[PDB]
Symmetry: C2
Subunit: 133 residues, 2 copies
């Protein structure tokens, strides 16, 4: 018997795809799907050196919990993890990592896609592009 987990974290720290995958590991699961959001080095023509992220944390957390609850109603997932970085996120570093685990791949795949689309659509987190001055 293993209680299912929702691990949600907003943090200024560098996100590690390894540490996050570990959080959703289970012997009852055969699939883990992940999404990693990275700072791309350009936006509409100009060179980007980093992205800066801000949020109203309480609200943001609450919205991520809604997403988790919704996921668990539509799919038989086991563990979910959602990490978002705040502050400056330099090029090629991760601003968001999501991971979901399940018995079979369909659930985890569909869950992760929904998670990322929904988070981008519904969570109060903003970004400012930092260029070269």
């Amino acid at each position: 018997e293993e209680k299912s987990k929702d691990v949600i974290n907003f943090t200024a720290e560098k996100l590690s795809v390894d540490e996050v995958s570990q959080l959703v590991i289970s012997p009852l699961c055969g699939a883990i799907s992940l999404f990693v959001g990275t700072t791309r080095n350009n936006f509409e023509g100009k060179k980007v050196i980093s992205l800066e992220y801000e949020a109203y944390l309480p609200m943001a957390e609450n919205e991520v919990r809604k997403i988790c609850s919704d996921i668990r109603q539509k799919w038989p997932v086991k563990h979910i993890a959602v990490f978002h970085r705040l502050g400056l996120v330099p090029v090629s570093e991760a601003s968001i990592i999501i991971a979901v685990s399940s018995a079979h791949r369909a659930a985890s795949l569909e869950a992760v896609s929904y998670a990322i689309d929904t988070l981008k659509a519904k969570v109060p987190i903003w970004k400012k592009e930092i260029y070269e001055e």
Copy 2:
């Protein structure tokens, strides 16, 4: 605006797979999205307890089929790097038998590519799995 040659990294190996090492292979400054799928040995199958899965790959056919998958992906979606690692031999419970990673400018490509990749690999690539019980 440097050119960075796009990569297809395909590997069959008896070694333990690392989700970190595989993600590194598809990293790009031109990409904002990396999607991954990790296949793990589940500890049961139709009632009975499983201790490991054993995988055997018909080669080089299995490589050739993974290359087809990569080519097909690149015809429909604007992905940048693809990586497909499959472990062979005994893969104990909770360890990874397959890690697929795809990167792109934007998330739709990488999400869609990875699902297509895993479904298609399970459908078309000649790898035999035998359940090992207790």
